Amino acid sequence: HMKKLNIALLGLGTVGSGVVKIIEENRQQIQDTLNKDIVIKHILVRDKSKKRPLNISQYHLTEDVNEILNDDSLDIIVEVMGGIEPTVDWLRTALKNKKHVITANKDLLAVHLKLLEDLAEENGVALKFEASVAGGPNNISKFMGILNGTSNFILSKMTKEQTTFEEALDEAKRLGFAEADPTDDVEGVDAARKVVITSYLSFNQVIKLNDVKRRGISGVTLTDINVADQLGYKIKLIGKGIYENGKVNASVEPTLIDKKHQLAAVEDEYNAIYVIGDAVGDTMFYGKGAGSLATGSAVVSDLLNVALFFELPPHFELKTDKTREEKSNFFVVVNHVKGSIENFENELKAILPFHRSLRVANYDNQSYAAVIVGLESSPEELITKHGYEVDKVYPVEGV
């Protein structure tokens, strides 16, 4: 009675090894509880000579991806290799050959997920990427998230321990939160990728990485943090997607967050996605990022799901909402300002277009900061043409 599920793994790093371990220790149970026998028939690796643990030696390792793609006995391909090229083409071929695909590929972006999803539907097979999307998870109009643990950890350290960015980054390296080249984290690239992904899942719209307006945390100073603090705000690296009039506006940047906002409290390496919609209340999901074990665990869950369902636009519409029934805020830092804080405030009151509120604060010697709530657009150019040196502008949220 037992049905054999022949699978292949593309890649054998920490995640692939974890998938293998998890399959081994549950094989007996998956047999007994579900009468499917999962056989890992091939594992693609870069180097077949590498010294590997004993448990790996019993599987058939290959360096030739065509050996896997042309094996008609395979039911499912599990890709944990990473990369866009040639990896995505591999998955395309697999789907065209009527193989289910499960991927935890961390480099996939919306363009890739869309084309693979359609190709899968087209060929009557499953594409699963839960392990790829990795931790938090109808009509969402906006999301804001803390999407990179290392960056958030650094800002928390600076804020709590009153250190410079440089000191906080070094400390994060020593403690294992940041890597030796931390660029992907501190320049906001990782967060930008997650904004692309979150935008695809939230809005069913594809944007490119390069459409995400991006600024990292390496220019945030202790002075920014303490002045924000005095004004009632924390500083977070926020990844944001706003879907207005059929268009996604996506960004990642240092952002002042009102201290009472749920996101303001998300500290250290924790992440969170805050979701806003019509008409419902706001929601938020909070937790750390996935490790190898959790990613591997998600892969095997997806694998079992597809095994269960062996032998799509949701577009579940409202309204419905018919029956039964967006300004911007800015933190502006100006340098080389002669005259008093009162005079800077008065000048700002005269030059700004209409807005909801204005508060100014001392920043440094001849430097002031202003938080302006309720403008239609950045006042940066306007302030610049009135002769102020604008050091920088950060958006302000939770107002």
Catalytic positions are: 194
In the region spanning residues 42 to 61, those forming contacts with its own copies, defined by CB under 8 A, are 53-54
CA 182 to chain CA mean position, Å: 16
Q: Which is nearer to its own copies, 160 or 386 (CB)?
A: 160
Q: What are φ and ψ of residue 314, in 5° steps?
A: -60, -55
Token code pair at residue 309: 């369902």
State the minimum distance, in angstroms, from the CB of residue 30 to its own copies. Answer: 9
Stretch touching its own copies by CB under 8 A, among 140-148, 249-257, 282-290, 347-355? 282-290
State the minimum distance, in angstroms, from the CB of residue 176 to its own copies. Answer: 15
Q: Which residues contact 252 (CB under 8 A, 6 or more apart)?
A: 147, 188, 191, 192, 195, 212, 213, 214, 215, 237, 238, 239, 240
Q: Which is nearer to its own copies, 285 or 357 (CB)?
A: 285
Q: Which is nearer to its own copies, 287 or 339 (CB)?
A: 287
Question: For its own copies, what does the binding mask look like between residues 117 and 136, x meaning CB under 8 A?
Answer: -----------------x-x
Stretch touching its own copies by CB under 8 A, among 167-175, 286-294, 330-338, 391-399? 286-294
Position among 219, 287, 353, 387 found at the interface with its own copies (CB under 8 A): 287
265 contacts its own copies (rule: CB under 8 A): yes
229 contacts its own copies (rule: CB under 8 A): no
284 contacts its own copies (rule: CB under 8 A): yes
Sign of CA dihedral 298, 303, 309, 312: positive
In the region spanning residues 293 to 352, those forming contacts with its own copies, defined by CB under 8 A, are 293-294, 297, 300-301, 309, 312-321, 323-324
- Residue 362's closest CA among 344, 380, 349? 344
Q: What are φ and ψ of residue 331, in 5° steps?
A: -110, 115
State the minimum distance, in angstroms, from the CB of residue 168 to its own copies. Answer: 18
Q: Which is nearer to its own copies, 290 or 369 (CB)?
A: 290
Helix runs in the chain, H state only: 14-34, 65-69, 87-96, 110-122, 130-133, 149-161, 165-175, 183-186, 189-203, 222-231, 292-308, 341-351, 380-385
Q: Which is nearer to its own copies, 160 or 247 (CB)?
A: 160
270 contacts its own copies (rule: CB under 8 A): yes
In the region spanning residues 67 to 86, those forming contacts with its own copies, defined by CB under 8 A, are none
Torsion of CA 53, 54, 59, 64, to 10 degrees: 40
Token code pair at residue 385: 């043409």
- Residue 185's closest CA among 289, 72, 40? 289
Stretch touching its own copies by CB under 8 A, among 94-102, 170-178, 249-257, 287-295? 287-295
Judged by DSSP in three states, 326 sits in coil
213 burial level (CB within 10 Å; 0-12, 13-18, 19+): middle
Q: What span, in angstroms and rounded, lies between the C-alpha atoms of 241 and 253? A: 12
Helix axes 110-122, 87-96, angle to 10 degrees: 20
Question: For its own copies, what does the binding mask look like between residues 138 and 177, x meaning CB under 8 A?
Answer: x---------------------------------------
Q: Which is nearer to its own copies, 16 or 239 (CB)?
A: 16
DSSP annotation string for 227-262: HHHHHTEEEEEEEEEEEETTEEEEEEEEEEEETTSG
Q: What span, in angstroms and rounded, lies between the C-alpha atoms of 21 and 92? A: 27
Question: How many residues sit in the footprint of its own copies (CB under 8 A)?
Answer: 53
- Residue 76's closest CA among 305, 280, 346? 305
Q: Which is nearer to its own copies, 284 or 341 (CB)?
A: 284
31 contacts its own copies (rule: CB under 8 A): no
Q: What span, in angstroms and rounded, lies between the C-alpha atoms of 268 and 277? A: 27
Q: What span, in angstroms and rounded, lies between the C-alpha atoms of 154 and 137? A: 25
Position among 286, 345, 347, 358 found at the interface with its own copies (CB under 8 A): 286
Q: Which is nearer to its own copies, 251 or 295 (CB)?
A: 295
User: Which residues sit at the interface with its own copies, rule CB under 8 A?
Assistant: 14, 17-18, 21-22, 25-26, 29, 33, 53-54, 134, 136, 138, 260-262, 264-267, 270, 279-288, 290-294, 297, 300-301, 309, 312-321, 323-324
